[PDB]
């Protein structure tokens, strides 16, 4: 620690979470592991209320070149907050912590599926609409998210969608095993060119759009991920979810247009969507 470059010290100060502000229960995972090493912790804030936080241990940083990455990352990232993106607490500097709110209802995609919950027709379009909030934001400070989907947006205690999986809360699902070791939602030209813009991330939400629709069916089940770029080249896309509104899947479509330039803006699609949104009963 005491070989870190004063002046990026200095920086990072403002993420900082001294260690005698956090409390990190490394006994409790959160969600079962099917997260990784995220931990329950709580947060105190300057007036001393507790928060309860998701603590992600770094344990693939090592070397101080890789911590200084790391502290730029957290300086960056502490910059984005929206209600529908998920924030950054801050950070701890054993690896070094990312510590981020708790989010009680986890994955959107989970959430979804799940037979006990009841979302209507209005509360999924509500979903998708939050979504396209926290990715207007995001397209709006340049950031290109790239793994938009149900499985990468999580639910708070009070049913805010958080676009998460990116920045520090980046690689949500890597698992580490003892002994073993998204090209569904990608659009067409990010599946030739293997680069992704804020166009390639529409794409990537008319696919997330169709997964609320469904309540979170998988999208060309009968599709090999190697034909899927044939198939998109044939002109076939997702077909109309039995209880969408045609209005909604005309914007779903709009989305999966194979010009980049065609596909509406997040701004636009928080319009269309908002709109839709508000001729429901609730
Ligand atoms: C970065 O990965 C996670 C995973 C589960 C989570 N629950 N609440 C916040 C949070 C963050």
Same mark, same amino acid.
């Given at each position: 620690?005491?070989?870190?470059?004063?002046?990026?010290?200095?920086?990072?100060?403002?993420?900082?979470? #001294?260690?005698?502000?956090?409390?990190?229960?490394?006994?409790?995972?959160? /969600?079962? #592991?099917?997260?990784?090493?995220?931990?329950?912790?709580?947060?105190? &804030?300057?007036?001393?209320?507790?928060?309860?936080?998701?603590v992600k241990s770094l344990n693939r940083i090592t070397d101080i070149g890789e911590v200084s990455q790391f502290l730029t990352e957290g300086?960056? +990232?502490? %910059?984005?907050?929206?209600?529908?993106?998920?924030?950054?607490?801050?950070?701890?500097?054993?690896?070094?912590?990312?510590?981020?709110?708790?989010?009680?209802? /986890?994955?959107?995609?989970?959430?979804?599926?799940?037979?006990?919950?009841?979302?209507?027709?209005?509360?999924?379009?509500?979903?998708?609409?939050?979504?396209?909030?926290?990715?207007?934001?995001?397209?709006?400070?340049?950031?290109?998210?790239?793994?938009?989907?149900?499985?990468?947006?999580?639910? &708070?205690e009070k049913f805010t969608v958080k676009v998460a999986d990116f920045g520090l809360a980046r690689d949500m699902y890597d698992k580490e !095993?003892?002994?073993?070791?998204?090209?569904?939602? +990608?659009?067409?030209?990010?599946?030739?060119?293997?680069?992704?813009?804020?166009?390639? %991330?529409?794409?990537?939400? /008319?696919?997330?759009?169709?997964?609320?629709?469904?309540?979170?069916?998988?999208? !060309?089940? &009968?599709?090999?991920?190697?034909?899927?770029?044939?198939?998109?080249?044939?002109?076939?896309?997702?077909?109309?979810?039995?209880?969408?509104?045609?209005?909604?899947?005309?914007? +779903?479509?709009?989305?999966?247009?194979?010009?980049?330039?065609?596909?509406?803006?997040?701004?636009?699609?928080?319009?269309?969507?908002?709109?839709?949104?508000?001729?429901?009963? /609730?």
């Open positions: 620690l005491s070989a870190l470059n004063p002046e990026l010290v200095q920086a990072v100060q403002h993420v900082v979470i #001294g260690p005698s502000s956090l409390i990190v229960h490394f006994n409790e995972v959160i /969600g079962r #592991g099917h997260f990784g090493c995220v931990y329950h912790g709580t947060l105190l &804030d300057n007036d001393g209320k507790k928060i309860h936080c998701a300086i960056i +990232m502490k %910059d984005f907050s929206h209600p529908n993106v998920l924030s950054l607490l801050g950070i701890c500097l054993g690896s070094p912590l990312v510590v981020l709110p708790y989010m009680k209802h /986890g994955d959107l995609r989970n959430f979804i599926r799940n037979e006990t919950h009841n979302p209507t027709v209005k509360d999924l379009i509500g979903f998708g609409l939050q979504v396209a909030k926290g990715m207007k934001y995001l397209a709006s400070k340049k950031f290109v998210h790239r793994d938009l989907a149900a499985r990468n947006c999580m639910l &708070d !095993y003892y002994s073993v070791h998204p090209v569904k939602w +990608m659009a067409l030209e990010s599946l030739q060119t293997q680069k992704f813009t804020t166009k390639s %991330d529409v794409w990537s939400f /008319g696919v997330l759009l169709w997964e609320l629709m469904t309540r979170g069916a998988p999208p !060309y089940p &009968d599709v090999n991920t190697f034909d899927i770029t044939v198939y998109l080249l044939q002109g076939r896309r997702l077909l109309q979810p039995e209880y969408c509104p045609d209005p909604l899947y005309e914007v +779903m479509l709009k989305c999966w247009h194979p010009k980049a330039e065609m596909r509406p803006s997040f701004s636009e699609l928080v319009s269309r969507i908002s709109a839709i949104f508000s001729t429901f009963i /609730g």
